[PDB]
A paper describes a structure:
α-1-Antitrypsin (or alpha-1-antitrypsin; A1AT; SERPINA1) is an abundant plasma glycoprotein secreted into the circulation by liver cells. Its primary function is inhibition of the serine proteases neutrophil elastase, proteinase 3, and cathepsin G that are released by neutrophils at sites of inflammation. In an initial antigen ELISA screen, 1 clone, 2H2, was found to produce antibodies with reactivity against M A1AT but little against the Z variant.
Antigen ELISA experiments showed that mAb2H2 recognized both monomeric and polymeric M A1AT with similar affinity, but there was poor recognition of either form of Z A1AT. Surface plasmon resonance (SPR) experiments using M or Z A1AT monomers that applied to a CM5 chip coated with mAb2H2 confirmed that binding was almost exclusively to the M variant. Here, we have taken a multidisciplinary approach, involving the generation and validation of an antibody selective for A1AT with an endogenous Glu342 residue — the M and S variants — whose epitope was localized to a structural scaffold region of A1AT that is essentially unaltered during conformational change.
Residue numbers in the entry:
A (entry chain L): 1 to 115, 117 to 163, 165 to 204, 206 to 216
B (entry chain H): 1 to 52, 52A, 53 to 82, 82A, 82B, 82C, 83 to 98, 101 to 129, ...
Write the structure that this text describes.
């Protein structure tokens, strides 16, 4: 089958900014390429077909170009309603195949996370498990590193991370980092620290607690 | 106008079978070719099947050929996708699309293919460690399948809430939810997370109380 690859995988952009995203086919597809936009919780909507033909009703800021293997979609002046995932689709040959998508996200000023750490609950310890939960809320950009330290030593094993989608109101991101241990292993140690680092060599945002209160 | 409404999704064991339906209205369903397209949890789109306007001819990609059957009942204005020998990789949201989906897509119906047992979550309160705004938490551990609905004080605490995407832990799901409130309100005013897991027909409340 024909392989479609899109670039970039994701990008930030501001209101009014010119945005161009690209789509490459593994072989010549004779301009049989369509672009789709998808917003969270909704189905994809066709914006452009035949590489550069606008679907009826689509605003004028959208356009497409390219030929053969290389194609692009351009938003001349970004609107906030343009955020979402964009997919290209080749229909030159069945099976019609999609590109991997480009996530278009909202640019804003850098923001440090509000970090909160929570010891395992008594109820969970009674079951024999021990999840230490850390929230990093309302930060930007989405790329952030979380570092767990247990009595001063870094801990990587047993950590599960989860990242929200971009907040539609303030353009920030939030993530939870959960360190799960057995009750016995958790109670072998005293201090638990959660550290949020954005760029290297900067001081982290740190929260900690001592098991021996 | 044109309506395309999918139904029939749900949880199915691998190796199982399931038939999806797409009820069409607002146009001559018997004169268009119809298609199924699916979206994986990784948010990739893939064409599933294509059928002629009369239903006599069908086309499939190799991933589903021999297992999936697209059919239609023109007298009932319904499109179908019969799935058999289901694989976990078939887990996806399934859309019916008119023709090539230039204009009309349905809203989708969700299929989960898994052997995991339906399980209600264990809900644990996350209070700050014993030492202006206060952030509280709600650990929703070990449930299956998706989804759960998390609210705080039955919805009245809507702002400053972050419910995080579920992660895989064991053969079950785990997520947490955070709520941020003025320090002048909690614990003097109660904060409780409400967790609904409809697949298990459960709705649990967990009050957040300070740690001893
Ligand atoms: Na547990
Ligand atoms: Na067939
Ligand atoms: Na309540
Ligand atoms: Na685990």
């Amino acid at each position: 089958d024909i392989v479609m690859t899109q670039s970039p995988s994701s990008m930030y952009a501001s209101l009014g900014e010119r945005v161009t995203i690209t789509c490459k086919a593994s072989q010549d597809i004779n301009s049989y390429l369509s672009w789709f936009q998808q917003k969270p919780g909704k189905s994809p909507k066709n914006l452009i077909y035949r590489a550069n033909r606008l679907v009826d009703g689509v605003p004028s800021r959208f356009s497409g170009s390219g030929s053969g293997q290389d194609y692009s979609l351009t938003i001349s002046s970004l609107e906030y309603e343009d955020m979402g995932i964009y997919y290209c689709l080749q229909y030159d040959e069945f099976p019609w195949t999609f590109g991997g998508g480009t996530k278009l996200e909202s640019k804003r000023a850098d923001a440090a996370p509000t970090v909160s750490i929570f010891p395992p609950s008594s109820e969970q310890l009674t079951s024999g498990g021990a999840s230490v939960v850390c929230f990093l809320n309302n930060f930007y950009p989405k790329d952030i590193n979380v570092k767990w330290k247990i009595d001063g030593s870094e801990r990587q094993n047993g950590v599960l991370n989860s990242w929200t989608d971009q907040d539609s109101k303030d353009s920030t991101y939030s993530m939870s980092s959960t360190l799960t241990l057995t009750k016995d292993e958790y109670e072998r140690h005293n201090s638990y620290t959660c550290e949020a680092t954005h760029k290297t060599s900067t001081s982290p945002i740190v929260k900690s607690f001592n098991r021996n209160e | 106008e044109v309506q395309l409404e999918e139904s029939g999704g749900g949880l199915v064991k691998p190796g199982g079978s399931l038939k999806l339906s797409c009820a069409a209205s607002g146009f001559a369903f018997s004169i268009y070719d119809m298609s199924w397209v699916r979206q994986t949890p990784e948010k990739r789109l893939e064409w599933v099947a294509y059928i002629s306007s009369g239903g006599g001819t069908t086309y499939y990609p190799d991933t589903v050929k021999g297992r999936f059957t697209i059919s239609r009942d023109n007298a009932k204005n319904t499109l179908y996708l019969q799935m058999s020998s289901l694989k976990s990789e078939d887990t996806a949201i399934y859309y019916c699309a008119r023709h090539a989906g230039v204009h009309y897509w349905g809203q989708g119906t969700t299929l989960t293919v898994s052997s995991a047992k339906t399980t209600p979550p264990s809900v644990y309160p996350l209070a700050p460690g014993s030492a202006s705004m206060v952030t509280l938490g709600c650990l929703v551990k070990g449930y299956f399948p998706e989804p759960v609905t998390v609210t705080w004080n039955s919805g009245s605490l809507s702002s400053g809430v972050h419910t995080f995407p579920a992660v895989l832990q064991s053969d079950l799901y785990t997520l947490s939810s955070s709520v941020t409130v003025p320090s002048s309100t909690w614990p003097s005013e109660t904060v409780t997370c409400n967790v609904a897991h409809p697949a298990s027909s459960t709705k649990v409340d967990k009050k957040i109380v300070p740690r001893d």
